[PDB]
């Protein structure tokens, strides 16, 4: 069965005293005016439960909680037993063992952080077949930190079951320290307004409460329809790698590139991605990828990285300080080393200067070490510009050959022929969608364009340097990106002292783009009481064709008042008409007078304050 | 002739176009787009980049608010003087010299 829990489930949020204050608590509570289940059975324990039972002869004993129906709480004739054990439970009527309709019982059950909390309250009632109307708070009873997981529960034995949901409440702590009232902050616009001004009374006026944003209905990915995988194996499972001073640069293009193949390959002793997190490459897109391959000892592999210094960094192969890509190195001792010491791998050691990044040098002129010109004299004072390697597998592991590849790519905002494995979806337009073009994540409304892009441009841009125009990676059509419609939410309220009715103002929207707790919020979303003004969509007021003095100012010459009772919307009137009977020979003269005393109030001073720098910022530290 | 009204409109135009144009600065991170950071890093360091953009945009918005608040006092003094002029010149004959 079902029923309506008007205002229940409020429990003291924590063991902290407050007085005459109106607090704001964000915690798991039971929303007011909620459809809750009525019983005279296995029931789930979502996150929290509001159990309220009316009985007179104690027809109920306790509860059973857990997932694999686990802890028992029961109340026999006099005492109560609390313990968690493996029991022989369809029940009918160890870690810890805490064995210690006129009457109404409300219980709140929560297990957060593994701590089990019980809140309780009793009250006399002379009522039948209905939840009593009133406000009451549930004090804590006992905290048991069993540290077990629970998914469902069932009582021991009419009653009601309510579930707690994440909500924020405005609670009212009296001088005696007891919550005599509360506000469900999400129930209706009026409650939200009472939240913004932390009081249960709201004077007449207009109040801005929240921001309203249309939400992405769906998600759209548009990627190139190319199919051939990037020949990563040809780069890695190749025949042999060139000597470092002549590092091969092999480009990768026009291919879908799965990088999970490199991740799952567990023969890589160093996989550190620099410009991007490795686990996101499969969804990005790239302009072009360069694979630079060469062989270096493990000690000198550290030279191959952005913004470092070393002989190979300066004389042979330099990665710039703003490198974009991933660096892959692995052992190839079995396939890149001779028995007597291989010297096929060579490196440049006698150069006249350093190298700018990505610069290859094949210079073949004798290096000078003395002060005399070399003139092709090899030996003293003139060295050969290169140096050799010694490759025997009998040395320390730091000296073994390491085939090292730098998967350099430009992640520029460019045509991006290369992409990852991502499944393109059909293109839907004119709707607020969470699109994804070539990795340009974002949300908005896409429409046809009257623009013309240059045959190499990939997307437009706004003055804010934000994307507002794109070309479809599959159909080459210009699309218009407009951010999803939005605005502020204002509540048009006659004072709470006067009425609980409210009207809602949506700022800068068209009354069709507005579509929320439905039993309260949705009433202020449709009907024949929706009005569109120059300040946005006004919902909850009647557009009368009269005109009166401005009572609550909406905007653009529109004011709204509470009249008959309901709320009206009118174009304000400046004042009463008149026509002074002017004539060339007609004057008017007073025959009496009046002495009228009026008042002007003018602020003169304000409280004098003085805040200490150290005491406020650091205090006693 | 209408220099003052146009100046007010223009000072509103800039210092607001400046605020919009300030939404595209690195402030020390890899990119000026949050999503570009989001779609390129794990949260443990995309957090650092987003934090740097947050600090930059917070300084920018606070500075803009302060300038607007100061300009508001100037416009308010002008409007109070205009109301005084309306009451004393329009609703009467003034004996104040050059007012």
């Amino acid at each position, epitope marked *: 069965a079902y029923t309506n829990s008007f205002t229940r489930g409020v429990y003291y949020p924590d063991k902290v005293f407050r007085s005459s204050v109106l607090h704001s608590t964000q915690d798991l509570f039971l929303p007011f005016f909620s459809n809750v289940t009525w019983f005279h059975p296995v029931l789930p324990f979502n996150d929290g439960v509001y159990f309220a039972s009316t009985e007179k002869s104690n027809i109920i004993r306790g509860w059973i909680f857990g997932t694999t129906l686990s802890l028992l709480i029961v109340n026999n004739a006099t005492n109560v037993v609390i313990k968690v054990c493996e029991f022989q439970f369809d029940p009918f009527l160890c870690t810890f063992e805490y064995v210690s309709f006129k009457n109404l019982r409300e219980f709140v059950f929560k297990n957060i952080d593994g701590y089990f909390k019980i809140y309780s309250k009793h009250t006399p009632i002379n009522l039948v077949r209905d939840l009593p109307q009133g406000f009451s708070a549930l004090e804590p009873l006992v905290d048991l930190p069993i540290g077990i997981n629970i998914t469902r529960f069932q009582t021991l034995l009419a009653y009601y079951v309510g579930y707690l949901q994440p909500r924020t409440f405005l609670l009212k702590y009296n001088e005696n320290g007891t919550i005599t009232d509360a506000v469900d902050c999400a129930l209706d616009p009026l409650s939200e307004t009472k939240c913004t001004l932390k009081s249960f009374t709201v004077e007449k006026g207009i109040y801005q409460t929240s921001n309203f944003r249309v939400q992405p209905t769906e998600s759209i990915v548009r990627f190139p329809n190319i199919t051939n995988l990037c020949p990563f194996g040809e780069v890695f499972n190749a025949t042999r790698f060139a000597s470092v001073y002549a590092w091969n640069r092999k480009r990768i293009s026009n291919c879908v590139a799965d990088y999970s193949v490199l*991740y*799952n*390959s*567990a*023969s*890589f*002793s*160093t*996989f*550190k*991605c620099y410009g991007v*997190s*490795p*686990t996101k490459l499969n969804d990005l897109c790239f302009t072009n990828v360069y694979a630079d391959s060469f062989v270096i000892r493990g000690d000198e592999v550290r030279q191959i990285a952005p913004g470092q210094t070393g002989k190979i960094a300066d004389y042979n192969y330099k990665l710039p300080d703003d490198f974009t890509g991933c660096v892959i190195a*692995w*052992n*190839s*001792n*079995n396939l890149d080393s001779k028995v007597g010491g291989n010297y096929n791998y060579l490196y440049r050691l006698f150069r006249k200067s350093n190298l700018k990044p990505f610069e290859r040098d094949i210079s073949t002129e004798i290096y000078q070490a003395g002060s005399t010109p070399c003139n092709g004299v090899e030996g003293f004072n003139c060295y050969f510009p290169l140096q050799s390697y010694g490759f025997q*597998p009998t040395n320390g*592991v730091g000296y*073994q050959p390491y085939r090292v590849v730098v998967l350099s790519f430009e992640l520029l905002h460019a045509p991006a022929t290369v992409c990852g494995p991502k499944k393109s979806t059909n293109l839907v337009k004119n709707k607020c969608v969470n699109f994804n073009f070539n990795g340009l994540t974002g949300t908005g409304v896409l429409t046809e364009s009257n623009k013309k892009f240059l045959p190499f441009q990939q997307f437009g841009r706004d003055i804010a340097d934000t994307t507002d125009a794109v070309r479809d990676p599959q159909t080459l059509e210009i699309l218009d990106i407009t951010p999803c419609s939005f605005g502020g939410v204002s509540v048009i309220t006659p004072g709470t002292n006067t009425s609980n009715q409210v009207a809602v103002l949506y700022q800068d929207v068209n009354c069709t783009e507005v579509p929320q707790l439905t039993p309260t919020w949705r009433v202020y979303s449709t009907g024949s009481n929706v009005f569109q003004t120059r300040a946005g969509c006004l919902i909850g007021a009647e557009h009368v064709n009269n005109s009166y003095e401005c009572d609550i100012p909406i905007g653009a010459g529109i004011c709204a008042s509470y009249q008959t009772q309901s709320i009206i919307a009118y174009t304000m009137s400046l004042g009463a008409e008149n026509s002074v009977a002017y004539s060339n020979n007609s004057i008017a003269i007073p025959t009496n007078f009046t002495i009228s005393v009026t008042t002007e109030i003018l602020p003169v001073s304000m409280t004098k304050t003085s805040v200490d720098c150290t005491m406020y910022i650091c205090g006693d530290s | 002739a209408l220099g003052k009204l146009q100046d007010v409109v223009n000072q509103n135009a800039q210092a607001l176009n400046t605020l919009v144009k300030q939404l595209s600065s690195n402030f020390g991170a890899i990119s000026s787009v949050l999503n570009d950071i989001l779609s390129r890093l*794990d949260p*443990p*360091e995309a957090e650092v980049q987003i934090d740097r953009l947050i600090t930059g945009r917070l300084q920018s918005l606070q500075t803009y608010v302060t300038q607007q608040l100061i300009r508001a006092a100037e416009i308010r003094a002008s409007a109070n003087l205009a109301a005084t002029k309306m009451s004393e010149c329009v609703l009467g004959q003034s004996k104040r010299v050059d007012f």
Partner: nanobody
Amino acid sequence: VQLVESGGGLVQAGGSLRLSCAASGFTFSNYVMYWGRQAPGKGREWVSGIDSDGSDTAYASSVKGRFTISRDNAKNTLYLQMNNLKPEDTALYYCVKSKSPWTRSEFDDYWGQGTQVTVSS
């Protein structure tokens, strides 16, 4: 920093073993530890990775779907539970400190004591 690994032994097909190592000289909650094995006389390999929190786990393609990785931050212990074990897995296994925190890149600046793991029938 100090590392001593525990576990390992003669294991037959379908068997299990538990490896653990502590980290001192730093709290170890921030850093990420990988599992590395070198077959004798061959190259070192990356077996599996764990996120700094413990939520994200990655494995080599070789051990995907067969091995269980788990670590406990509070007593600083990293564990590896291995299923469908075989003579193919024979290697010296290393738990390494990745020198860095709150990042997912996989490589190690340091190498632990290692364990001698002999797999035979």
